[PDB]
Amino acid sequence: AHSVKIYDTCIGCTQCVRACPTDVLEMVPWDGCKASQIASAPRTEDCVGCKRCESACPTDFLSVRVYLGAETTRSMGLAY
Amino acid sequence: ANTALTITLSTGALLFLGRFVFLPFQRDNVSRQGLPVQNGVTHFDAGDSRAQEVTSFLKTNDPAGFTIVDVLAWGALGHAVGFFILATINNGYNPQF
């Protein structure tokens, strides 16, 4: 499906996980920020490409990036 | 206008210019520029079998290194100059400045 990437600029605010409508992102332990956590995308095959996770990231430029592509059945959001 | 005399004089003059006064300058410039290079290396070094310099045709015994290709080039320039001269003399156009 689409490709979702997380960068070291993340601050572990979890706001991208809460905005995801298909449960693609999750928070994992990390040691590069004060929050001691970082976002991750273990199940991007369920990603639809809404980039709501991108709109919720507060860093200057996005620590979470969605690149789109493939456009499989789950990606197109088809119920038929 | 004498065609033979004009052509011969122009060709000889430009061959002399290319052989004596301009040969070192042309040699220096071809040495500085060198063979055209494709990307870092020459076209032949990149795998172009048809871009190899023709050494057999470029062999010469003239002590100054004057090659038959140089002869052709300077002779073509001389013939062009001679025919320009002949056409302008046998023109009939007088601007009368």
């Binding site: 070291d8 600029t9 601050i11 040691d31 590069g32 920020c33 004060k34 709109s55 507060p58 860093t59 200057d60 430029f61 | -």
Partner: protein, 64 residues
Amino acid sequence: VIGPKRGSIVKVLRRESYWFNDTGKVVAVDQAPGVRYPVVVRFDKVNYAGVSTNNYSPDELEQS
């Protein structure tokens, strides 16, 4: 210490930042070994998302 002093005026060298070649005020610097972007910078003007603060490493901030 890690980076600039608190309250100092720093200029951003991050090319991808909305505030490249812009001046901000340092709010806090974290001394925890392992933090990659510890310097907190406040800016007078917001970015497109509406955020006026960010985190930078000391190597991409210069003193005025």
